[PDB]
Amino acid sequence: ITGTSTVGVGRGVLGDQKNINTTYSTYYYLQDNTRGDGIFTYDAKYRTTLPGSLWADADNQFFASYDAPAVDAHYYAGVTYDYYKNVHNRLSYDGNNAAIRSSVHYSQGYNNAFWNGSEMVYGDGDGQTFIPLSGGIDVVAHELTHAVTDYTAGLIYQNESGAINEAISDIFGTLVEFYANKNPDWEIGEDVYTPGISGDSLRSMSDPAKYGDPDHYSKRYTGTQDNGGVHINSGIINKAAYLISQGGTHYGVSVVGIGRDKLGKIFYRALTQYLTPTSNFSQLRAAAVQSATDLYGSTSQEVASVKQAFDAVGVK
Numbered sequence: 001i002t003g004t005s006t007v008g009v010g011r012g013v014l015g016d017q018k019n020i021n022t023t024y025s026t027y028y029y030l031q032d033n034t035r036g037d038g039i040f041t042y043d044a045k046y047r048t049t050l051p052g053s054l055w056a057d058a059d060n061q062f063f064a065s066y067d068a069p070a071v072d073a074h075y076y077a078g079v080t081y082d083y084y085k086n087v088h089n090r091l092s093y094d095g096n097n098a099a100i101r102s103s104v105h106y107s108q109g110y111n112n113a114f115w116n117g118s119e120m121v122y123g124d125g126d127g128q129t130f131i132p133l134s135g136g137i138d139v140v141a142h143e144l145t146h147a148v149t150d151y152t153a154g155l156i157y158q159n160e161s162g163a164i165n166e167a168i169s170d171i172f173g174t175l176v177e178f179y180a181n182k183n184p185d186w187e188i189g190e191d192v193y194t195p196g197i198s199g200d201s202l203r204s205m206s207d208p209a210k211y212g213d214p215d216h217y218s219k220r221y222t223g224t225q226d227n228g229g230v231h232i233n234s235g236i237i238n239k240a241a242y243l244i245s246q247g248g249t250h251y252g253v254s255v256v257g258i259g260r261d262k263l264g265k266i267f268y269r270a271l272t273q274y275l276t277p278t279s280n281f282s283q284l285r286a287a288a289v290q291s292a293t294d295l296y297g298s299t300s301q302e303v304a305s306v307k308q309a310f311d312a313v314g315v316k
């Protein structure tokens, strides 16, 4: 759409009010001209055909229940774009300011969200297992990071490489949640998962085993489900990343934490300079060690912590 940039206001899935960047041309559209080539949000009107219609609103006010998921998808993609730009100096997922597109209200009672190779897609949830998935900034940023991976390392979605791909998305989705300072934690999806149950979440990076995911290479899943356990074995890497950041003792191996910022720097460098489509866990360790080395010197504590963390999860 071609029009005048403006700012509207609405309420997101959690009931919080926020301002969003819109475009005016007869209607007010969810089109944000302030970031790269634009952030565009679409209505999939409960169907599976994509992208759907660009979101149009008559009065620039987005307080309807039906508007909530679009408000958050649009807003949270802006935050994610901001994180990448400000923190890592990367312009959009492709590094060249590609437009960011998302569709909401996908299907009916769809309990998932994903990057499809071209855009983001978010279900509304069935209202029991999930509420609309774009209400979770970690979920939005996790999905958008899959686009960053596609343009960079290109990790194939299966087996070890697939679990790497997943862990990267959880790591960065969590880093973005801390960046926005939105009640940050080391859990994934807590804000939109099981509305009736307080205290849980989809996955935990601090303690993957809490939800039955492995926290040591010895416990890795070797079957064929889930594309070879992409959502299971990611817990091993997630746990290593938690330890690099926060520190701790895990299976008797002690790790000194080096903090979130460095965690993000090391990982981004690994992802963008060293990983390849077929990278395995062991190659990830090497990439991470090398990145830390590059960044901080080989006799650095940073390097040391990266080694200790992978040793702790049994990755050689």
Ligand SMILES: [Ca+2]
Residues within 6 Å of the ligand: 138, 174, 177, 184, 185, 186, 187, 188, 189, 190
């Ligand atoms: Ca979280």
Ligand SMILES: [Ca+2]
Residues within 6 Å of the ligand: 190, 193, 194, 195, 196, 197, 198, 199, 200, 201
């Ligand atoms: Ca819950």
